[PDB]
Amino acid sequence: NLQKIDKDSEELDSKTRKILEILNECHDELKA
Amino acid sequence: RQINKLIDSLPGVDVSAEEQLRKIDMLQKKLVEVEDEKIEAIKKKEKLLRHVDSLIEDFVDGI
Secondary structure: HHHHHHHHHHHHHHHHHHHHHHHHHHHHHHHO | OHHHHHHOOOOOOOOOOOHHHHHHHHHHHHHHHHHEEEHHHHHHHHHHHHHHHHHHHHOOOOO
16 A cells, blocks of 8 residues: 555656646746 | 508607607716726736736746
């Protein structure tokens, strides 16, 4: 179970990271 | 026949020149009111828009 939970947790934090990236990439195309 | 049915449909027949002259006056007024309402609304929406935009600007990556 703990492995499931942890896998989930990491996957989620992944999606959050994945979005923050995009924002920065947008910021680039817009600034630089 | 046609010319009558048309004369019946002809607008203004029953109404007076006064019953009209005011009806126009009113519409003129109720019309200003509605535009000020429109203006205001427009402003409030653009403020709302400015809000959203601000948010979106702060989510950008790159300086």
